[PDB]
């Protein structure tokens, strides 16, 4: 896998785990996940616990995590999963600038839904009080996956193969908005 | 907003099975995927003793396991208003080896019921051997927290703007007309809800 790899995969998902150290234990929390590129955007409340982690510009791991089937093998030891993850290590850096504050927050909508950003009350220099925004470059990557059928080397009679987990946007309206109509039944994190 | 509630924690650890674990390998943290055995409040994690995680496991660190359901998109009026609609967990506890085959067995058992129920009975059982390539560890909860959002958008403003929420469903697909009726049955089924 390669950089583009990564950037596939961070351009398909909107959400994160971020790993960091506090007082000698680890502590994982979700985040939503801007980017652009290889570039990972985070935002939240400065009046937040996370924004003085972050603030230190100590490393952080980001993870991202993609499940796409039961793999049912013959042998119970033969099961598995087939997913795709990556492991991002990298140092936050505040962004002050109020817009490209603004920026981060339309990569980040239209990540979720190409079109929304046009047709919604964008935020305000006084929303933007007291929200932080930290740029986080790969220092180090890291991607693994499985795919495929399961791994038989037997011949007894028992069913073997996968079942398919879909993510979908399922109807939420038919009077919404036609970009938020033509998202109905389409599969994500694919 | 949070839980602390045992009968919720148990709850989401019944539905999901995998997790992230988060831990410290020279003052550096890392986070893996990994499939979630569990038995009430108990995680069982496993996999091979070649693995860098198992040396992690035995020095008995505390660990931070963390779960994530997504369930929806969350549009607003207003860009500031919108959100994810979510259920989170984070679990701290220090891991201990199970040593014993017997209990490896019923581990195997716990996590193969919860992937497919029905399938341990109809599926090739771990030889002696095959267990002792695999370690098993019990992580009880030190401490946990949960996290969720649910529901519509927050908004004050009165202008014409669609708002509401786009679910995201995880479902099982079919596999084919010829697997057992324990299979078909998942066949359609939403899940880690």
């Known amino acids: 896998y390669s950089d583009e790899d990564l950037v596939a995969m961070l351009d398909r998902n909107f959400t994160c785990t971020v790993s960091f150290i506090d ?4 502590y994982a929390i979700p985040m939503m996940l801007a980017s652009e590129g290889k570039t ?3 935002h939240g409340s400065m ?4 924004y003085g982690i972050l603030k230190t510009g100590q490393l952080i791991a980001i993870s991202l995590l993609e499940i796409n089937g039961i793999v049912l093998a013959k042998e ?3 099961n598995s999963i087939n997913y795709v993850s990556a492991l991002i290590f990298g140092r936050p850096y505040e962004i002050d600038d109020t817009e490209k504050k603004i920026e981060v927050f339309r990569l980040l909508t239209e990540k979720l839904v ?3 950003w046009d047709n919604s009350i964008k935020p305000s220099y006084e929303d933007l009080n007291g929200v932080f925004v930290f740029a ?5 990557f890291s991607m693994k996956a499985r795919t495929g059928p399961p791994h038989d080397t037997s011949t007894d009679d028992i069913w073997s193969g996968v079942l398919p987990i879909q993510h979908t946007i399922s109807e939420a309206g038919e009077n919404a908005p036609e970009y938020v109509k033509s998202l109905y039944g389409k599969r994500i994190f694919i």
Request: net charge positive; charged share 30%; no cysteine.
């Open 23 to 26: 007082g000698g234990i680890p």
């Open 40 to 42: 990972i955007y985070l």
């Open 47 to 50: 009046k937040s616990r996370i």
């Open 76 to 78: 119970i030891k033969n």
């Open 114 to 116: 190409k079109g929304r």
């Open 136 to 140: 986080v470059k790969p220092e180090t």
